[PDB]
Design an enzyme around this catalytic site. Structure first.
Site, mmCIF file in Angstrom:
data_model
loop_
_atom_site.group_PDB
_atom_site.id
_atom_site.type_symbol
_atom_site.label_atom_id
_atom_site.label_comp_id
_atom_site.label_asym_id
_atom_site.label_seq_id
_atom_site.Cartn_x
_atom_site.Cartn_y
_atom_site.Cartn_z
ATOM 1 C CG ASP A 15 -1.854 1.178 1.242
ATOM 2 O OD1 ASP A 15 -3.005 1.094 0.503
ATOM 3 O OD2 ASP A 15 -1.684 2.362 1.566
ATOM 4 C CD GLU A 17 0.036 6.372 2.256
ATOM 5 O OE1 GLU A 17 -0.584 7.210 2.072
ATOM 6 O OE2 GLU A 17 -0.401 5.156 2.712
ATOM 7 C CG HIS A 172 -4.614 8.200 4.936
ATOM 8 N ND1 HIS A 172 -5.069 7.873 3.712
ATOM 9 C CD2 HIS A 172 -5.570 8.632 5.628
ATOM 10 C CE1 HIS A 172 -6.378 8.377 3.684
ATOM 11 N NE2 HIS A 172 -6.696 8.673 4.893
ATOM 12 C CG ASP A 177 -3.412 2.380 4.910
ATOM 13 O OD1 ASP A 177 -3.926 2.732 5.793
ATOM 14 O OD2 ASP A 177 -3.165 3.157 3.792
HETATM 15 N N1 LIG Z 1 -7.973 12.875 0.665
HETATM 16 C C1 LIG Z 1 -6.976 12.746 0.001
HETATM 17 N N2 LIG Z 1 -6.389 13.875 -0.869
HETATM 18 C C2 LIG Z 1 -5.357 13.928 -1.653
HETATM 19 N N3 LIG Z 1 -4.456 13.017 -1.933
HETATM 20 C C3 LIG Z 1 -4.987 11.715 -1.105
HETATM 21 C C4 LIG Z 1 -5.836 11.607 -0.549
HETATM 22 N N4 LIG Z 1 -6.167 10.167 0.122
HETATM 23 C C5 LIG Z 1 -5.005 9.625 -0.491
HETATM 24 N N5 LIG Z 1 -4.211 10.655 -1.358
HETATM 25 C C6 LIG Z 1 -3.185 10.140 -2.242
HETATM 26 O O1 LIG Z 1 -3.075 8.929 -2.208
HETATM 27 C C7 LIG Z 1 -1.984 8.063 -1.602
HETATM 28 C C8 LIG Z 1 -2.470 6.756 -1.303
HETATM 29 O O2 LIG Z 1 -3.596 6.591 -0.624
HETATM 30 P P1 LIG Z 1 -3.923 5.852 0.794
HETATM 31 O O3 LIG Z 1 -3.430 4.289 0.643
HETATM 32 O O4 LIG Z 1 -5.523 5.876 0.974
HETATM 33 O O5 LIG Z 1 -3.259 6.522 1.814
HETATM 34 C C9 LIG Z 1 -1.672 9.255 -0.710
HETATM 35 O O6 LIG Z 1 -0.189 9.079 0.017
HETATM 36 C C10 LIG Z 1 -1.790 10.249 -1.274
HETATM 37 O O7 LIG Z 1 -0.755 10.796 -2.211
HETATM 38 MG MG LIG Z 2 -2.105 3.849 2.205
HETATM 39 MG MG LIG Z 3 -3.509 2.744 -0.559
#
Ligand SMILES: Nc1ncnc2c1ncn2[C@@H]1O[C@H](COP(=O)(O)O)[C@@H](O)[C@H]1O
Ligand SMILES: [Mg+2]
Ligand SMILES: [Mg+2]
Length: 200
Positions: A15, A17, A172, A177
């Site tokens: 997962d 970031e 996040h 995750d």
């Molecule tokens: N609410 C949000 N707004 C902007 N970018 C996001 C958001 N959520 C996730 N991202 C981008 O998507 C990546 C992966 O998302 P996640 O696995 O949900 O943490 C993050 O590291 C950010 O670069």
């Molecule tokens: Mg993530």
């Molecule tokens: Mg993700």
């Protein structure tokens, strides 16, 4: 049957970031690269790969990005860039025994974004070949939908809710995750679900 035989010796939970901003930064770049190796039958975590990654196009993490992910600038400064991290992954795969053709493994992600969009998009930008083991994966949201007969609305949070699981760690954070994906997978296997590749 609880914890049936599965089709894979191991599942590799991933997962990313990435750099981000409001409105979104362009291009985005991977800043955290976690993989959990799960035993294919029990879904227990047996090994972890984890590296932060130094972004190059937008090298300073935005306030938004640090707020979202908890990743501070000192965690990415001095790190190798994605080209080197991918070489570290290959080495890790080799040492784990996952490069044997008779050892069957597959990546598992929450959504398709990580391996359908994020990694191929950055590798294409950089001119880097994508390793073949990144080209197939299981989208947990899709697997969950077959296991439970329903489409989760918001990713890991709603999948934990559906299965009455407490969230592990910080949303996040890449590694946290991954632990929730692993925990959701273990529960689906307890209910009798056999996982299948979903990528096309
Ligand atoms: N609410 C949000 N707004 C902007 N970018 C996001 C958001 N959520 C996730 N991202 C981008 O998507 C990546 C992966 O998302 P996640 O696995 O949900 O943490 C993050 O590291 C950010 O670069
Ligand atoms: Mg993530
Ligand atoms: Mg993700």
């Amino acid at each position: 049957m609880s914890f049936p035989p599965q089709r894979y010796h191991y599942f590799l939970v991933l997962d990313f970031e990435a750099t981000c901003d409001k409105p979104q930064i362009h291009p985005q770049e991977i800043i955290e690269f976690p993989i959990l190796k799960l035993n294919g039958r029990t879904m227990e975590i047996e090994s972890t790969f984890h590296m932060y990654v130094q972004p190059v196009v937008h090298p300073q993490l935005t306030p938004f990005c640090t707020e979202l992910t908890g990743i501070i600038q000192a965690m990415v400064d001095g790190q190798p860039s994605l080209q080197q991290v991918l070489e570290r992954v290959d080495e890790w795969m080799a040492k784990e025994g996952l490069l044997d053709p008779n050892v069957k493994s597959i990546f598992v992600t929450c959504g398709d974004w990580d391996l359908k969009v994020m990694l191929p998009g950055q590798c294409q930008y950089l001119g880097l070949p994508v390793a073949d083991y990144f080209k197939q994966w299981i989208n947990l949201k899709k697997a969950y939908s077959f296991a439970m007969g329903c489409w989760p609305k918001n990713g890991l949070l709603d999948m934990n809710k559906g299965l009455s699981l407490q969230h592990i760690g910080r949303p996040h954070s890449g590694i946290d995750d991954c632990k929730n994906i692993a925990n959701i997978m273990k529960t689906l296997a307890y209910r009798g679900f056999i996982f299948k590749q979903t990528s096309k």
